[PDB]
Write a protein that binds this ligand. Structure first.
Ligand SMILES: [Mg+2]
Ligand SMILES: [Mg+2]
Ligand SMILES: [Mg+2]
Ligand SMILES: [Mg+2]
Ligand SMILES: [Mg+2]
Ligand SMILES: [Mg+2]
Ligand SMILES: [Zn+2]
Lengths: 196, 92
RNA sequence: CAUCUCAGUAGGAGCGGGAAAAGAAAUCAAUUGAGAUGCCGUAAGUAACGGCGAGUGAAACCGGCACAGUUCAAACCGAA
RNA sequence: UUUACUGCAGCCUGUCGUUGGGUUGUGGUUCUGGAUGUACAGUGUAGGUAGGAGGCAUCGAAGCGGGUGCGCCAGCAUUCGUGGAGCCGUCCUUGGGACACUACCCUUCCGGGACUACGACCCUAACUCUGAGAAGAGGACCCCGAUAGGUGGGCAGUUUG
């Protein structure tokens, strides 16, 4: 075979606990725990994942690592009347996935940019880590790029907040076609949120 | 009350009178793969379960003696509407 | 009345344009077919769910409106 | 309001994840040196069921020491030695199995080496607390996410014809 080195990065991250990525994980999680909520990094940790998701080594493209807590929707017990079906909240996880939470926090930290995509990069018993790719639609390098200048359109602003990323569309039930997508496409809101 | 273990009666299948042996019917264990069991597991969540949180009711003063009549020739059983007795034995 | 219903309604938070979302099948079919998405009609109060109670409740096929297709990641080249 | 019905928080506890490294104690994982297998008597230990008979040997076959596998201090294995012929059976030692050096996977054999689930101990290196820090104290526990059971008028949905 003649495989690119991106293929080797992909293979190393396929079963990370069985490769050298486990030791890198042990050393990296200390640094990542020391960091805050939204950290900018020079290069993606997993270059192949970022490149397949649309990352390019050019000006106006920013990669950030976001830290999100684990578990479901941390919910308060109601203090007024409920019918025993709406009283219980401990087992109620949300409908917003952890990856989309990370994407939206990254978007909040960078008001002038747009979230492109994100990928999983680690987790421990208390946190998950995602690296979020963001694009600067007002940078001339991005404006010239004909594979990215769609992000300069008026409908591309607030992508992550309106569920238009890959994770958002997965969360909206539009990751597939056909049966099961009766109440999901073209939108969750279009069917009175009965899908999902 | 006593009933004979074996007596001659009508076989609905062979369509004749043959000796038949009377056997008490034992209630079986409910399958966990029936639609009601699956529905109970599906309606299990947080809160009241509806009809699946009902406690079973009472009992009549005497239950019927559930009997099954198996023909000794064709080895097929049929069960008829049965009486209601406090104490039931087989006459041997 | 507790599942159910009221209803994903009311209300809340975020984003956001003249529209938005969806959108070019890891689809729907059925013995052999069609060919992105949206919206309308119909299927149909049917299938399905349901103290199988009260109620809730599709989609495809089909007829229309309008029609539109494509761009990356990689292989090969290596700053062109 | 409560030992009404049905739930929900809080709390207790198991399991999984977080979560690593060593030491032993528990099961077989996996297999080397032996096929170790034997009512009755044996020239002889069914050399696993067997082409129901047919190979080796002074260039090796024994009656012996605590008898190296084993065992009824017999006898197969040539071994530290010295003694100077073990057969195969159509005379089957009238068979629980009756027997040729012919790739033994198989009730043994304890180097059980190697991964493994439970438990006990230790280590620090994750992680936690203190400190501005050097560091100190804990430590794979606790916290935390999830799940399983309990307790639960703390709460809250009703019912109480
Ligand atoms: Mg923040
Ligand atoms: Mg659009
Ligand atoms: Mg799209
Ligand atoms: Mg509804
Ligand atoms: Mg009360
Ligand atoms: Mg009410
Ligand atoms: Zn009969």
């Amino acid at each position: 075979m003649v495989k690119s080195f991106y293929g080797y990065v992909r293979d190393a991250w396929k079963n990370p606990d069985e490769t050298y990525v486990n030791e890198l994980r042990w050393e990296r999680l200390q640094v990542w725990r020391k960091q805050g909520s939204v950290t900018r990094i020079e290069r993606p940790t997993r270059i192949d994942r970022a490149r397949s998701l649309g990352y390019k080594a050019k000006q106006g493209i920013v990669v950030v690592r976001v830290n999100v807590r684990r578990g479901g929707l941390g919910h308060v017990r109601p203090n007024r009347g409920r019918r025993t079906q709406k009283m219980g909240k401990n087992k109620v996880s949300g409908g917003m996935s952890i990856q989309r939470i990370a994407e939206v926090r990254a978007d909040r930290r960078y008001p002038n940019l747009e979230v492109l995509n994100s990928y999983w990069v680690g987790e421990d018993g208390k946190h998950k880590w995602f690296e979020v790719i963001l694009v600067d639609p007002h940078h001339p390098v991005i404006k010239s790029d004909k594979n990215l200048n769609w992000v300069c359109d008026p409908s591309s602003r607030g992508r992550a907040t309106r569920g238009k990323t890959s994770a958002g569309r997965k969360g909206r039930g539009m990751a597939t076609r056909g049966k099961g997508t009766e109440k999901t496409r073209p939108s969750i809101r279009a069917y009175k949120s009965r899908g999902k | 009350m006593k009933i004979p273990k074996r007596f001659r009666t009508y076989c609905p299948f062979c369509k004749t009178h043959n000796e038949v042996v009377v056997e008490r019917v034992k209630k079986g264990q409910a399958s966990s793969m029936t639609h009601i069991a699956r529905q109970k597991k599906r309606q299990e969540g947080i809160g009241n379960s509806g009809k699946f949180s009902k406690v079973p009711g009472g009992d009549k003063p005497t239950k019927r003696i559930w009997l099954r009549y198996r023909c000794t020739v064709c080895k097929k059983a049929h069960q008829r509407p049965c009486f209601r007795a406090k104490k039931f034995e087989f006459k041997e």
